[model samples]
Target: VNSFSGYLKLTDNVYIKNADIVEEAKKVKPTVVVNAANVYLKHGGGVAGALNKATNNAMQVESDDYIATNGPLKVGGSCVLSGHNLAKHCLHVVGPNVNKGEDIQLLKSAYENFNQHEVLLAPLLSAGIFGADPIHSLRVCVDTVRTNVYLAVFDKNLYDKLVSSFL
Candidate 1:
């Protein structure tokens, strides 16, 4: 992470980081941390899994309760819950996959969804892990994220790339 001097400043509020999402969440204590969620909104896999572990399963319980009330979320569907140890709140968003050919706009939708919130700590949506190109993932992350949102890359290989994306 020290390969760069500072974050990649893309806009007045957008800053790209070469740090772990959880570490930044712990450090920044932002208003919320965006969790790359699944359709079921279950906090047992990927970002939801790690976040739930970080918060001592508190996030899992909250997500379960949310599902019980609102049911499963559609594509690009999202909701906020208690952050516990991570941030003040946890924003769970079901991102789009390339299979639907709606990746671009839907990816934008996920990033743009949190525009109303302030001081957000976000991941690059598990870039290329499930689907989508990592480079394109970072591009959308930078291009569409609101000023209030701060983006980060958890992969060590992406650290320098994230730094090169800016200064």
Candidate 2:
């Protein structure tokens, strides 16, 4: 794992949970955080709290183009796929495993570290892996992030890589 960066991992198999993700965030100290679910669309979601705090800010950014429909993965459903706004660089990478090299490439290309002047946190939005059943997609995220900075995850179960020493 990259000691210069912080990592927050979770076992989001079905619906996105708040307690687990929030606990991990407290350790990373990410000023801007992002999630797969649009939990902040609601009144009391973490995004709102982030916005209120001096270090928290949320945004709804997506790397790919997707419509916010009424499905669970959509804003109306429990999936909440529009929480990219939580970080200044958080982005929801849309699409399936076939042509998702774009998401990985986009993340690397779009990532702006500003010469590593400060520590920035990025939590892998794994809902796409379990919710969409794209294991390769998750692998791509890990592979793409291998060269970036990562923080020490206080919670061991948040990421399989952290738990299994894959990083």
Candidate 3:
């Protein structure tokens, strides 16, 4: 029911059942995914650029077709719903930013929300909304999107894993 973009990586502590990264993609059913790399924020590599890259990669899918979804959902700031370049729709799930450890509950809540509603024109990562460090936030955003990613990046090893598991 939606399209997504951004990197895909498997972390040991993502969620319950420790679902494989590729398997997660299979469950989500995305249209096209971005490849993961050792991209750093300061070097023009971060969630922000990754998102832009993902969006570019998703050129086949119209801008209106994909909506941005962000992690560490905080409502008070200039997040997805607010600001000038905000996406049409955004998820804005809470993350472990303030919390010392991972908050799968927030992630679950986000997924639950998507399941309960229609997520047209939304993305897994939010851009230019939070006052927090753009670099750190971008990584968090990337990790968050990878959780329920549906599309698999092509011609990339990391993404190849996703491609194989794609349903």
Candidate 4:
């Protein structure tokens, strides 16, 4: 496995990790891996795209099921899908566009919605493709979750920057 840059404690139980998300998924074997998805469940880029492609697009199929049955998923909405390679379950949550500062509210909603789960794996919502500041996104996630949470990050430089800022 690739070495991680570092880690931080969001709370007594929640943790923020600066590492390769996919590799961390392999090691941690979390119960739920979150997909930063959109309403259409289009896994075309960012963490969602990587995960969908990793799982042979099974997540997209599951997402399709949600859409087919419940119509378009809304922001602050989420659904659970069966995990493919790394985790036992996949949590799909729709976040706002990256540039939206108000996306923090959506992230809060997503985290609050999944507070029931035991172990969850997620990215820095709205931090990457959404173009939000990583530090702000991390803070929102930490504030929102009450259970054990793993926030995975892929870029080492970004990770270092976050660590420096936090320290």
Give each model's clash number.
0, 13, 12, 1
TM-score of each: 0.83, 0.34, 0.31, 0.86
Q: In lDDT terms, which candidate is top?
A: 4
Instruction: Give the Cα error of residue 146 in candidate 1, in Å.
Output: 2.8
Evaluate model 1: give its TM-score: 0.83
Candidate 1 C-alpha lDDT tens digits along 24-141 = 7887777778888876777665566777788888777877788899899867767878778877788887777565554556777777767768567777764644466667666776
lDDT of each: 0.71, 0.32, 0.30, 0.75
Ranking by TM-score: 4, 1, 2, 3
Candidate 4, residue 98: lDDT? 58
Could you give the candidate ranking by lDDT, starting with the highest?
A: 4, 1, 2, 3
Clash count, predicted structure 2? 13
Q: Which residue runs does candidate 2 get wrong by more than 4 Å?
A: 1-19, 37-120, 126-130, 146-167
Candidate 3 lDDT score at position 31 = 32
Evaluate residue 117 in candidate 4 and report its C-alpha lDDT on the 0 to 100 scale. 85
In model 1, residue pairs whose N, Cα or C atoms come closer than 3 Å (at least 3 residues apart or on different chains), thus clashing, are none
Q: Model 4 segments beyond 4 Å from truth?
A: 1-6, 99-104
Tens-digit lDDT track of model 4 for 86-146: 7898787776775654455676776675687866778877668877778877777777777
Winning candidate number (TM-score):
4
lDDT of 3 by residue, 52-135 (tens): 343343321322232332322232121222111223232223222222333323433333333322322222222122223323
